[PDB]
Amino acid sequence: HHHHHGSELPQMVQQLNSPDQQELQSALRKLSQIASGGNEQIQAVIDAGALPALVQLLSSPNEQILQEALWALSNIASGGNEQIQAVIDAGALPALVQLLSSPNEQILQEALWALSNIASGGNEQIQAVIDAGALPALVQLLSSPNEQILQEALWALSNIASGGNEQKQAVKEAGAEPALEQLQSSPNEKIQKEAQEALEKIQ
């Protein structure tokens, strides 16, 4: 069931620019929720012009606003290829890549999730993730002592690796092979499986 009507979206979008922080968060949450409900609903959020404002919030020093903005963007990017494309065209990628070097694990997790959603699209979507410079960051993350970070980084890398030959080649050129060859021997069963599958995708 629809919780919100289409004629309420414009108001929510305007409120992503409120100086009132509880108004802002409230609107962030509603857009997240609507965007969680399938392609038709995601499209309504995009058509209402929510993307530009969501991307602005990605540089926020307020982790509460940041987490909800990332989550909303992840939900939008979980739709169709053209919906993922809209996220890319709105300039989300530089901000997401920047967040890959965050000392905050919770932020890291949501930026990686947004990125792997984006990288689930077509070769065009994947190439934009590569072009934005995700690969050097993702590779550096592969030598983290934190298994949860590893799993998250592998999901993104594995998705990029599901692209065409150009995309697989970029993965090889960013030096991912030796790291994936190591993690293929991981005692963590989830990491081992993802690493193996990613390695096999890039031959």
PDB file of all heavy atoms in Angstrom, residues 78-94:
ATOM      1  N   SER A  78      18.676   1.067  -6.289  1.00  0.00           N
ATOM      2  CA  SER A  78      18.270  -0.344  -6.332  1.00  0.00           C
ATOM      3  C   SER A  78      17.190  -0.612  -7.385  1.00  0.00           C
ATOM      4  O   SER A  78      16.744  -1.742  -7.532  1.00  0.00           O
ATOM      5  CB  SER A  78      17.819  -0.836  -4.953  1.00  0.00           C
ATOM      6  OG  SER A  78      16.714  -0.087  -4.490  1.00  0.00           O
ATOM      7  N   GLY A  79      16.797   0.420  -8.135  1.00  0.00           N
ATOM      8  CA  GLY A  79      15.800   0.269  -9.205  1.00  0.00           C
ATOM      9  C   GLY A  79      16.359  -0.122 -10.567  1.00  0.00           C
ATOM     10  O   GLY A  79      17.321  -0.895 -10.664  1.00  0.00           O
ATOM     11  N   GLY A  80      15.745   0.414 -11.621  1.00  0.00           N
ATOM     12  CA  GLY A  80      16.171   0.138 -12.997  1.00  0.00           C
ATOM     13  C   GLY A  80      17.456   0.850 -13.402  1.00  0.00           C
ATOM     14  O   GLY A  80      17.895   1.785 -12.730  1.00  0.00           O
ATOM     15  N   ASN A  81      18.055   0.400 -14.506  1.00  0.00           N
ATOM     16  CA  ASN A  81      19.288   0.980 -15.035  1.00  0.00           C
ATOM     17  C   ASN A  81      19.200   2.491 -15.273  1.00  0.00           C
ATOM     18  O   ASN A  81      20.178   3.215 -15.060  1.00  0.00           O
ATOM     19  CB  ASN A  81      19.717   0.267 -16.326  1.00  0.00           C
ATOM     20  CG  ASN A  81      20.307  -1.123 -16.069  1.00  0.00           C
ATOM     21  OD1 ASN A  81      20.265  -1.642 -14.946  1.00  0.00           O
ATOM     22  ND2 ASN A  81      20.853  -1.733 -17.116  1.00  0.00           N
ATOM     23  N   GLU A  82      18.030   2.958 -15.704  1.00  0.00           N
ATOM     24  CA  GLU A  82      17.839   4.374 -15.994  1.00  0.00           C
ATOM     25  C   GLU A  82      17.670   5.188 -14.711  1.00  0.00           C
ATOM     26  O   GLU A  82      17.901   6.398 -14.688  1.00  0.00           O
ATOM     27  CB  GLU A  82      16.666   4.590 -16.959  1.00  0.00           C
ATOM     28  CG  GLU A  82      16.924   4.044 -18.377  1.00  0.00           C
ATOM     29  CD  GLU A  82      18.349   4.317 -18.900  1.00  0.00           C
ATOM     30  OE1 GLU A  82      18.741   5.506 -19.051  1.00  0.00           O
ATOM     31  OE2 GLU A  82      19.079   3.330 -19.174  1.00  0.00           O
ATOM     32  N   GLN A  83      17.271   4.501 -13.649  1.00  0.00           N
ATOM     33  CA  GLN A  83      17.155   5.105 -12.331  1.00  0.00           C
ATOM     34  C   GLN A  83      18.533   5.187 -11.667  1.00  0.00           C
ATOM     35  O   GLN A  83      18.883   6.215 -11.091  1.00  0.00           O
ATOM     36  CB  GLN A  83      16.114   4.343 -11.503  1.00  0.00           C
ATOM     37  CG  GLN A  83      14.730   4.411 -12.167  1.00  0.00           C
ATOM     38  CD  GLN A  83      13.654   3.575 -11.482  1.00  0.00           C
ATOM     39  OE1 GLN A  83      13.882   2.428 -11.082  1.00  0.00           O
ATOM     40  NE2 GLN A  83      12.459   4.146 -11.374  1.00  0.00           N
ATOM     41  N   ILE A  84      19.332   4.133 -11.801  1.00  0.00           N
ATOM     42  CA  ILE A  84      20.743   4.191 -11.433  1.00  0.00           C
ATOM     43  C   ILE A  84      21.459   5.291 -12.216  1.00  0.00           C
ATOM     44  O   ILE A  84      22.298   6.019 -11.658  1.00  0.00           O
ATOM     45  CB  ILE A  84      21.476   2.855 -11.701  1.00  0.00           C
ATOM     46  CG1 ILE A  84      20.832   1.706 -10.916  1.00  0.00           C
ATOM     47  CG2 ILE A  84      22.955   2.988 -11.352  1.00  0.00           C
ATOM     48  CD1 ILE A  84      21.318   0.321 -11.340  1.00  0.00           C
ATOM     49  N   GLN A  85      21.125   5.417 -13.501  1.00  0.00           N
ATOM     50  CA  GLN A  85      21.737   6.428 -14.350  1.00  0.00           C
ATOM     51  C   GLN A  85      21.435   7.826 -13.828  1.00  0.00           C
ATOM     52  O   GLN A  85      22.317   8.685 -13.794  1.00  0.00           O
ATOM     53  CB  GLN A  85      21.289   6.288 -15.813  1.00  0.00           C
ATOM     54  CG  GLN A  85      22.132   7.112 -16.809  1.00  0.00           C
ATOM     55  CD  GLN A  85      23.625   6.797 -16.711  1.00  0.00           C
ATOM     56  OE1 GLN A  85      24.030   5.636 -16.753  1.00  0.00           O
ATOM     57  NE2 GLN A  85      24.444   7.836 -16.559  1.00  0.00           N
ATOM     58  N   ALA A  86      20.190   8.048 -13.416  1.00  0.00           N
ATOM     59  CA  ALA A  86      19.789   9.342 -12.895  1.00  0.00           C
ATOM     60  C   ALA A  86      20.623   9.723 -11.669  1.00  0.00           C
ATOM     61  O   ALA A  86      20.994  10.883 -11.505  1.00  0.00           O
ATOM     62  CB  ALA A  86      18.302   9.356 -12.576  1.00  0.00           C
ATOM     63  N   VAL A  87      20.930   8.735 -10.829  1.00  0.00           N
ATOM     64  CA  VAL A  87      21.780   8.946  -9.660  1.00  0.00           C
ATOM     65  C   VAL A  87      23.180   9.389 -10.089  1.00  0.00           C
ATOM     66  O   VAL A  87      23.731  10.338  -9.527  1.00  0.00           O
ATOM     67  CB  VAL A  87      21.838   7.690  -8.745  1.00  0.00           C
ATOM     68  CG1 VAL A  87      22.885   7.847  -7.636  1.00  0.00           C
ATOM     69  CG2 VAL A  87      20.462   7.423  -8.137  1.00  0.00           C
ATOM     70  N   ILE A  88      23.727   8.713 -11.098  1.00  0.00           N
ATOM     71  CA  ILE A  88      25.037   9.051 -11.657  1.00  0.00           C
ATOM     72  C   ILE A  88      25.054  10.459 -12.268  1.00  0.00           C
ATOM     73  O   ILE A  88      25.961  11.243 -11.989  1.00  0.00           O
ATOM     74  CB  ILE A  88      25.491   7.998 -12.700  1.00  0.00           C
ATOM     75  CG1 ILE A  88      25.698   6.640 -12.024  1.00  0.00           C
ATOM     76  CG2 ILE A  88      26.753   8.462 -13.463  1.00  0.00           C
ATOM     77  CD1 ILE A  88      25.881   5.477 -12.990  1.00  0.00           C
ATOM     78  N   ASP A  89      24.043  10.772 -13.081  1.00  0.00           N
ATOM     79  CA  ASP A  89      23.922  12.077 -13.742  1.00  0.00           C
ATOM     80  C   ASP A  89      23.776  13.226 -12.746  1.00  0.00           C
ATOM     81  O   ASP A  89      24.127  14.364 -13.058  1.00  0.00           O
ATOM     82  CB  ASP A  89      22.720  12.103 -14.692  1.00  0.00           C
ATOM     83  CG  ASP A  89      22.890  11.192 -15.903  1.00  0.00           C
ATOM     84  OD1 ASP A  89      23.998  10.639 -16.122  1.00  0.00           O
ATOM     85  OD2 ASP A  89      21.890  11.034 -16.648  1.00  0.00           O
ATOM     86  N   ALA A  90      23.243  12.929 -11.561  1.00  0.00           N
ATOM     87  CA  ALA A  90      23.061  13.944 -10.530  1.00  0.00           C
ATOM     88  C   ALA A  90      24.362  14.191  -9.749  1.00  0.00           C
ATOM     89  O   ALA A  90      24.424  15.089  -8.900  1.00  0.00           O
ATOM     90  CB  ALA A  90      21.921  13.567  -9.599  1.00  0.00           C
ATOM     91  N   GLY A  91      25.390  13.399 -10.051  1.00  0.00           N
ATOM     92  CA  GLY A  91      26.739  13.624  -9.532  1.00  0.00           C
ATOM     93  C   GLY A  91      27.043  12.986  -8.189  1.00  0.00           C
ATOM     94  O   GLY A  91      27.943  13.434  -7.474  1.00  0.00           O
ATOM     95  N   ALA A  92      26.309  11.930  -7.848  1.00  0.00           N
ATOM     96  CA  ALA A  92      26.495  11.244  -6.568  1.00  0.00           C
ATOM     97  C   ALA A  92      27.883  10.632  -6.388  1.00  0.00           C
ATOM     98  O   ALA A  92      28.390  10.575  -5.269  1.00  0.00           O
ATOM     99  CB  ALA A  92      25.421  10.175  -6.370  1.00  0.00           C
ATOM    100  N   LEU A  93      28.489  10.191  -7.490  1.00  0.00           N
ATOM    101  CA  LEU A  93      29.687   9.336  -7.446  1.00  0.00           C
ATOM    102  C   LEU A  93      30.938   9.902  -6.764  1.00  0.00           C
ATOM    103  O   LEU A  93      31.553   9.186  -5.979  1.00  0.00           O
ATOM    104  CB  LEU A  93      30.025   8.770  -8.835  1.00  0.00           C
ATOM    105  CG  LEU A  93      29.049   7.756  -9.461  1.00  0.00           C
ATOM    106  CD1 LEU A  93      29.508   7.403 -10.857  1.00  0.00           C
ATOM    107  CD2 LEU A  93      28.903   6.489  -8.615  1.00  0.00           C
ATOM    108  N   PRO A  94      31.324  11.172  -7.059  1.00  0.00           N
ATOM    109  CA  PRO A  94      32.501  11.760  -6.394  1.00  0.00           C
ATOM    110  C   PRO A  94      32.365  11.778  -4.877  1.00  0.00           C
ATOM    111  O   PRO A  94      33.336  11.504  -4.167  1.00  0.00           O
ATOM    112  CB  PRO A  94      32.529  13.205  -6.923  1.00  0.00           C
ATOM    113  CG  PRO A  94      31.810  13.154  -8.205  1.00  0.00           C
ATOM    114  CD  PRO A  94      30.755  12.099  -8.060  1.00  0.00           C
TER     115      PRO A  94
END
